[PDB]
Amino acid sequence: AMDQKQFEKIRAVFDRSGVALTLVDMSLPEQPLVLANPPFLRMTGYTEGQILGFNCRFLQRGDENAQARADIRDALKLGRELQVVLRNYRANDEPFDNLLFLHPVGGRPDAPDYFLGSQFELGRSGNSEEAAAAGHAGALTGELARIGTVAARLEMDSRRHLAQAAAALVRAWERRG
Amino acid sequence: MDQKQFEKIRAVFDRSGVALTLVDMSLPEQPLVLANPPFLRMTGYTEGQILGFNCRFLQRGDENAQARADIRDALKLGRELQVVLRNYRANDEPFDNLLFLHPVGGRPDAPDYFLGSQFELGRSGNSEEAAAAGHAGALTGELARIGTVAARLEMDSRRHLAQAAAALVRAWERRG
Ligand SMILES: Cc1cc2c(cc1C)N(C[C@H](O)[C@H](O)[C@H](O)COP(=O)(O)O)c1[nH]c(=O)[nH]c(=O)c1N2
Ligand SMILES: Cc1cc2nc3c(=O)[nH]c(=O)nc-3n(C[C@H](O)[C@H](O)[C@H](O)COP(=O)(O)O)c2cc1C
Numbered sequence: 001a002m003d004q005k006q007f008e009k010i011r012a013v014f015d016r017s018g019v020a021l022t023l024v025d026m027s028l029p030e031q032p033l034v035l036a037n038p039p040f041l042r043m044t045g046y047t048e049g050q051i052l053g054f055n056c057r058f059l060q061r062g063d064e065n066a067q068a069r070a071d072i073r074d075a076l077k078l079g080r081e082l083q084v085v086l087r088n089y090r091a092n093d094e095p096f097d098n099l100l101f102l103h104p105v106g107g108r109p110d111a112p113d114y115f116l117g118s119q120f121e122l123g124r125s126g127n128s129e130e131a132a133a134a135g136h137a138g139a140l141t142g143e144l145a146r147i148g149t150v151a152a153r154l155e156m157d158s159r160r161h162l163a164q165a166a167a168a169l170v171r172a173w174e175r176r177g
Numbered sequence: 178m179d180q181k182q183f184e185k186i187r188a189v190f191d192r193s194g195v196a197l198t199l200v201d202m203s204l205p206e207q208p209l210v211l212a213n214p215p216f217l218r219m220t221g222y223t224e225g226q227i228l229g230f231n232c233r234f235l236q237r238g239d240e241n242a243q244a245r246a247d248i249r250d251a252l253k254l255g256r257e258l259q260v261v262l263r264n265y266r267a268n269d270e271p272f273d274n275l276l277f278l279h280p281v282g283g284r285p286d287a288p289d290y291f292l293g294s295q296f297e298l299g300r301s302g303n304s305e306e307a308a309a310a311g312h313a314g315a316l317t318g319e320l321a322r323i324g325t326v327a328a329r330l331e332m333d334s335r336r337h338l339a340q341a342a343a344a345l346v347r348a349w350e351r352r353g
Binding site for chain 2: 016018019038039125128130131132134135136137138139140141142143145146152155156158159160162163164166167
């Protein structure tokens, strides 16, 4: 029940964004990537053409994020937001930790038509991982509000909770050693 | 200046989820020319109640001498600055303002405008740093839209601003 016009608005927001953005079709269980912006493409080292149609787990290897994935599947089925860290791999197979922000888009409250994903690459920010992650959270919420997934009046409150959630996750991630 | 570019700034201002202000550098007293709804909501004034005036009404005379010195230098230089001001709402409630300053377009050392973005400190419990860094992240997005932050070196621009914001917060907490 989503206007071709909204889909295009989302595409335009992805294209101009300063954070990695992905969109996945929820109308089918294989859940293919349907949008993926330039910063996601550079972080991972793929091209847009080779990525679309695939499920985003192609960034993973085997059975590696068992906990994080079980959480992701629930969020998705329950149509809820989620932040989780994931062990991921670029096209060249180097490992990287991906702080993943998930957000339901469109559809109905417990049946979103799409899911948005935004990736924050950990370990690139040195002494200020919390701040960087939180900064990312802020730019994200701005994108969410422009699309309309976050209510405009609630953009601030959303940002504050998402930034906090990101800093916490970083802190637990640097508690892993 | 420009009619197309000023219209864009007005547009970005109206939609935004961050407190935004635009000051006209071409006027003797450097007055508010734009003031967006989350700014008005934070301070409790209306558009008409504050437009055309300089933002120094949020202060009570002499309380931010060092900071306003840093502000005047920045404005003269046309450089960015992040600074904490003691401020007062329309109902005279006091709050500390973490103020973000940015030069808008024009000339590198004499800009057409300054963009101010206010972040209220002390309403974020144990995660002031996170919330400030979040604010900086959102701001940078708006600056990238206006055109001030070029391209998508926005990311590194975001990371630094967020780093700076968090630092300023820590200092402000080392000052009980
Ligand atoms: C919008 C969006 C974006 C992403 C994902 C999901 C969605 C909906 N997923 C998760 C992946 O697609 C898959 O759901 C999880 O691996 C769990 O499902 P499985 O346990 O593999 O069946 C994901 N996976 C990953 O390893 N890195 C990521 O950044 C992406 N981003
Ligand atoms: C764009 C912009 C936004 C500003 N926002 C605030 C503000 O929110 N709160 C405040 O106390 N001062 C703010 N100021 C500062 C005053 O406008 C003024 O520049 C500063 O107080 C130093 O000037 P003065 O020493 O001549 O009073 C802002 C200035 C500019 C240029």
